[PDB]
Amino acid sequence: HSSGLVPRGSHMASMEIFGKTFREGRFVLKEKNFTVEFAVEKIHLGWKISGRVKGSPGRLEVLRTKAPEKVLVNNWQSWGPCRVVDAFSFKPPEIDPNWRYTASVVPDVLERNLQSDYFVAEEGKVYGFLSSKIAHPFFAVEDGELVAYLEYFDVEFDDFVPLEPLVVLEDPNTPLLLEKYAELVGMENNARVPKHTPTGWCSWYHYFLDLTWEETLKNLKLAKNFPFEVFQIDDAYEKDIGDWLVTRGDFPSVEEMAKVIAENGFIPGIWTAPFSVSETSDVFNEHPDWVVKENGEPKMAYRNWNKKIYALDLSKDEVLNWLFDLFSSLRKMGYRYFKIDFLFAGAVPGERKKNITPIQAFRKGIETIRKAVGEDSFILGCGSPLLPAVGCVDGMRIGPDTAPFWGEHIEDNGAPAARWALRNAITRYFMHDRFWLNDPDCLILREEKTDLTQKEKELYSYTCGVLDNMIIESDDLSLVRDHGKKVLKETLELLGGRPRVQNIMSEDLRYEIVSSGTLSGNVKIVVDLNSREYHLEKE
């Protein structure tokens, strides 16, 4: 009555799991420096590999199989591409040293080989890891083979710790597979998926760093005529990166800002970059030992605001206690919506006080933030590693920044452009209502001080509505007139459904997207991001 299963098909015959022929079973791999105990089990729509590892697994090879020609690949963080690429014509990108870790947490890979983080898909199969709690899970294409790895960053384990589980799903319906992968991720990490999604206003994509409190107050008054729940102050108010409770210019205190917003009937929101401290900040120069190091010196995590930005060492209790105090204080002031940006800084490789992986460090930081703000606060992640944030954040930015222009000829390289922001909202659609609520970035609906056309505004906004994503507007509200108000109202009527991108493996920016059971019934939108055209059907 033996009941173990083995793949029947010829492609699956290439599969090697921890050096073993792929079939159901329990297995052990003993190497010089580590030991893995693992199990392969048949699950609905595929297979699941799980287990435990001890020793020094380093860059642990999990799976090797033949590489498909056309693969949907995924960058580890918000801004980076999720796109279909030819596996064999890859050339190593030039990586800007100011933003190296946005490209990859293991840039040594990306400098030689095509990399995908967390999952990779081909038409009819999905390979995907269900978590990133200790190791960083990634795939590389190495001379025609697709290889799955768990990167432990030289950390040694005296006792067994769990592997990040790997699934291999198979069915002709690729969107279904991605949706089922994401359901498994959500269960593995106890994803937060709020039943209510906030609407709101954000200052960034009109004012940028030039926001003043005078302009903020003008918008706070006008916002009373818009369907906004949250009113969120973005980067501009703070004296420096890390000095979150010190304000600049005409801004009142951080506490005062919250109270003005709340007295005006909005849920107050605030932006921080909580794992980042700039070289000029009070907090860094007061606590130079609080940052990740390289040869005992502070390691640059990225360069922005025209200065070197360092990463907080989230293995340190002093650091976690400082974050806890900060976010507790914010909650006490009345903020209930927190946009937390540049989160990848917390996971940069480097020297930390405790010998834990960068992913373990990251998880401690974001969990600390979660505890501080409480259950009833909404956390929106941004510039963030995706799988390690599941279970912590409520909302997640899943694309590069939008901008007040389309970017018809702008390179797909994670820089701001509405075309690529929207592309990622489409290709990472399946995370929505499974990992978290997807944030496609703000709608820019003004009719002046913008390079966007009316058709572009419609296309972006209606797509986001069909996708049931977060809807946040970012404009000088004075400059939003009848067209912009109408687009918003119509977008909000498209929400509420269960969306699917039906041709997720598309190579030419033309997508067919359906959503069942919206507030407008069943809907379909077909979009072309290069021609900037759409066709929308509503029941």
Judged by CB under 6 A, the residue of 188, 234, 313, 456 near ligand 7D8 is 234
- 386 binds ligand 7D8, rule: CB under 6 A: no
What does the block give as tokens for 388?
């390690």
- 238 binds ligand 7D8, rule: CB under 6 A: no
For ligand 7D8, the closer of residues 234 and 475 by Cβ is 234
Give me the amino acid identity at 322. W
The set of long-range contacts for 12-15, using a CB threshold of 8 Å and a minimum separation of 24, is 12/65, 14/64, 14/65, 14/66, 14/145, 15/63, 15/64, 15/65, 15/168
- Residues touching ligand 7D8: how many (CB under 6 A)? 9
Is 464 annotated for ligand binding?
no
Helix (H, G, I), strand (E, B) or coil at 179: helix
For ligand 7D8, the closer of residues 64 and 397 by Cβ is 397
Least Å distance between CB 204 and ligand 7D8? 5
Nearest to 229 by CA among 262, 181, 278: 262
Least Å distance between CB 49 and ligand 7D8? 34
* β-bridge partners, 180: none
Nearest to 237 by CA among 335, 365, 382, 311: 335
Least Å distance between CB 213 and ligand 7D8? 17
* 170 in Cβ contact with 46 (< 8 Å): yes
Give me the DSSP letters along 77-125.
Answer: BTTS-EEEEESSS--PPPPPTTSHHHH-SSHHHHTTSEEEESEEEETTE
For ligand 7D8, the closer of residues 271 and 275 by Cβ is 271
For ligand 7D8, the closer of residues 401 and 456 by Cβ is 401
Nearest to 324 by CA among 277, 363, 366: 366
Helix (H, G, I), strand (E, B) or coil at 27: strand
CA 492/CA 266 separation, integer angstroms: 19
Least Å distance between CB 383 and ligand 7D8? 5
For ligand 7D8, the closer of residues 352 and 397 by Cβ is 397
CA 188/CA 516 separation, integer angstroms: 26
Least Å distance between CB 62 and ligand 7D8? 32
Q: What angle do CA 24, 27, 29 make, to 5 degrees?
A: 140
As a three-state string, the secondary structure of 200-264 is EEECHHHHHHHCCHHHHHHHHHHHHHCCCCEEEECCCCEEECCEEEEECCCCCCHHHHHHHHHHC
Is 205 annotated for ligand binding?
yes
- 240 binds ligand 7D8, rule: CB under 6 A: no
* 165 in Cβ contact with 129 (< 8 Å): yes
Least Å distance between CB 341 and ligand 7D8? 4
* Residue 240 annotated as catalytic: no
Task: Provide the edge-to-edge strand list for the sheet that holds 136-142.
Answer: 20-21, 16-17, 59-66, 145-151, 136-142, 114-117
Judged by CB under 6 A, the residue of 22, 47, 127, 204 near ligand 7D8 is 204
Looking at 401, 439, 441, 468, which residue is catalytic?
401
Is 444 annotated for ligand binding?
no
Do the strands 267-272 and 230-233 form a parallel or antiparallel pair, or are they unpaired?
parallel
For residue 485, the tally of other CB atoms under 10 A from its CB is 16
CA 258/CA 251 separation, integer angstroms: 11
Judged by CB under 6 A, the residue of 401, 433, 456, 473 near ligand 7D8 is 401
- 235 binds ligand 7D8, rule: CB under 6 A: yes
Query: Residues 145-184 vs ligand 7D8: string with x where CB under 6 A?
Result: ----------------------------------------
Q: What are phi and psi of 527, to 5 degrees?
A: -125, 145
- 274 binds ligand 7D8, rule: CB under 6 A: no
Is 234 annotated for ligand binding?
yes
* β-bridge partners, 66: 145
Looking at 117, 243, 341, 475, which residue is catalytic?
341
* Residue 401 annotated as catalytic: yes
Least Å distance between CB 386 and ligand 7D8? 14
What does the block give as tokens for 292?
């990740």
- 244 binds ligand 7D8, rule: CB under 6 A: no
For ligand 7D8, the closer of residues 122 and 235 by Cβ is 235
Is 82 annotated for ligand binding?
no
Q: What is the dihedral of CA 311, 316, 321, 324, to 10 degrees?
A: 50
For ligand 7D8, the closer of residues 280 and 516 by Cβ is 280
For ligand 7D8, the closer of residues 177 and 380 by Cβ is 380
Least Å distance between CB 357 and ligand 7D8? 25
Query: Residues 309-348 vs ligand 7D8: string with x where CB under 6 A?
Result: --------------------------------x-------
Is 340 annotated for ligand binding?
yes
Handedness of CA 481, 266, 474, 534 (dihedral sign): negative
Is 235 annotated for ligand binding?
yes
Nearest to 43 by CA among 169, 172, 130: 169
Judged by CB under 6 A, the residue of 358, 383, 414, 499 near ligand 7D8 is 383
For ligand 7D8, the closer of residues 235 and 243 by Cβ is 235
Least Å distance between CB 514 and ligand 7D8? 29
Running DSSP on this structure, what letter comes out for residue 12? G
Judged by CB under 6 A, the residue of 101, 271, 275, 406 near ligand 7D8 is 271
Residues that bind ligand 7D8 (CB under 6 A): 204, 234-235, 271, 341, 382-383, 397, 401
Residues marked as binding? 79, 205, 234-235, 339-341, 382, 397
Residues marked as binding for substrate? 79, 205, 234-235, 339-341, 382, 397
Known catalytic residues are: 341, 401
